[PDB]
Amino acid sequence: QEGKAVYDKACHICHSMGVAGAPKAHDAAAWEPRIAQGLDTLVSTVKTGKGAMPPGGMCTDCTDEDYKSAIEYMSK
Amino acid sequence: QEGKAVYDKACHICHSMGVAGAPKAHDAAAWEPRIAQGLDTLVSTVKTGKGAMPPGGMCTDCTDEDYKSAIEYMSK
Ligand code: HEC
Ligand code: HEC
């Protein structure tokens, strides 16, 4: 594979300029628009990945309830 | 509290404050001390994962040569 092609499909997700930051734990105001999407939508996004969040959120054995509880914890 | 143990196992890696940034593509000065470790050592680190980088760097089909080429591409 071409170095730039590997970069353009995978490594750029985190190694490019202008990567979107994660909503930080206990930043209630940043979490409000996320929580408004609904917990089921947010849990699905953790499982499928988004931007610099890899699919599964680095939690190999997380249940849906584990993901929901972690989101609730971070949101306040 | 519900969610804190999951957060402390997984989500804090990116959702806490003070997370180490990725060395950015074409940031030659950031890459210099990494390249000095040896390209093979950097390839092994991508495969193992490190901080907010998951094992494999989100490349499933990358040979060691594919990883080396991607690192060279980012390094200048
Ligand atoms: C976000 C989910 C990432 C993807 C996709 C890739 N990388 Fe990454 N990388 C990332 C972070 C946050 C860091 C810094 C880690 C730390 O805590 O220091 C890195 C670092 C590297 C390094 C340097 C390793 C070192 O010992 O200094 C290399 C060589 C590296 N990353 C290569 C790499 C390649 C080739 C990827 C695409 C296949 C790739 N990374 C994806 C975050 C992320
Ligand atoms: C870095 C490797 C991450 C880990 C581990 C987890 N998350 Fe994450 N998350 C991260 C980033 C960079 C972002 C922003 C994505 C973007 O581009 O918008 C996020 C975002 C979330 C979201 C919000 C999704 C949305 O559509 O706005 C949620 C609900 C989320 N993250 C939850 C979550 C949980 C529960 C994790 C532990 C199991 C977790 N994340 C880990 C980066 C990373």
Q: Which of A14, A69, A70 sits opposite B52 (nearest CB)?
A: A14
Within 8 A of A22 by CB-CB distance, chain B residues are 14-15, 19
Task: Say what the resolution is, in angstroms.
Answer: 1.1
Q: Which amino acid is at A74?
A: M
Elucidation method: X-ray
Of the candidates B16, B21, B11, B28, which has an alpha carbon nearest to the alpha carbon of residue B50? B21
Contacting residues for B2 by C-beta, under 8 A, at least 6 apart? A69, A72, A73
Domain carrying residue A63 = 1-76
- Other C-beta atoms closer than 10 Å to the C-beta of B13 total 18
Domain count, chain A: 1
Q: Which of residues 29-58 of A touch B (CB under 8 A)?
A: 52-54, 57-58
Q: Which ligand 1 atom minimizes the distance to the CA of B42?
A: 29
Strand, coil or helix: what is A58? coil
- The token pair at B7 is 């957060």
- Other C-beta atoms closer than 10 Å to the C-beta of B9 total 16
